[PDB]
Every structure is written in C-alpha cells, then in structure tokens.
Ligand binder design. Sequence first.
Ligand SMILES: [Cl-]
Ligand SMILES: [Cl-]
Ligand SMILES: [Cl-]
Ligand SMILES: [Pt+2]
Ligand SMILES: [Pt+2]
Length: 134
Amino acid sequence: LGKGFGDHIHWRTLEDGKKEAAASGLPLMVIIHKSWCGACKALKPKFAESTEISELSHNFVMVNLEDEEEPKDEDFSPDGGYIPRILFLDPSGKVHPEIINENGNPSYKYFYVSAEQVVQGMKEAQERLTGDAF
Ligand SMILES: [Cl-]
Ligand SMILES: [Cl-]
Ligand SMILES: [Cl-]
Ligand SMILES: [Pt+2]
Ligand SMILES: [Pt+2]
C-alpha cells in the first residue's frame, strides 16, 4: 500500500483516512504522486529510509494517492499541478495550504525533495493541526 514510501508506515485511503482522522483527532498527511514521475521516484527511498518520518507518522493519518487516486478537488493543488505534492489536513479533513516546505522553492510550496524537509513539514503540521491549535 505504500507504493515505495515505506511498508512500515500505516497507509489509508483518503475516504477511510478522513473517517479515522475525525474519530481519532489526528491530522492527515496526503502525498500525491505519479508512477511515471522522476521526482516521485526519487523521493520514495528517501522517505522510506527515514526513521524520523516513521516516528512522526504515528501522529498522522498517512495517505498516499497514486495516479488516478488524485482528488478532483482544487483544494489539493493550491499553487499548481506539479508532483509530488505533500499537503496537511486538519482532523476535520480541511486542507491547510499555509503549511508549506519552508526550505524549498516558494513557487512550489508543497514540493519536498529530502527527508529532512519532510520532517520539518510534519513537525509543523503536528504542532499546528492537532487539537485545533491553529
Ligand atoms: Cl514526468
Ligand atoms: Cl520529474
Ligand atoms: Cl520528468
Ligand atoms: Pt517528471
Ligand atoms: Pt493519473
């Protein structure tokens, strides 16, 4: 179910994941990716091999959406249709586009290229989205 992002991580569908998030009070982390894309291919082993990403993932409903699993919902492309994109959602299921890859390029807010960048996004989302801190 991880599609290369790591089989030691619990992966949910978006629909099941939103149900779990609401019931557990967990934010969601949604990774949109395509099976042909070079950026997606490159990110996968970096994500899968990160102990810190795995430890942080317990605080989220983790969702990866491959190819046609991508939502037909503009909330999931706030600044463009590049891939992969990582978006964080509150437990009620709303996308929080203000949580971005701060160490990336400002034109590609949801484009993360290293495990270290992903970890920083997860840490911010955990703090901001859990318990409606925002
Ligand atoms: Cl491509
Ligand atoms: Cl690419
Ligand atoms: Cl390409
Ligand atoms: Pt590509
Ligand atoms: Pt597709």
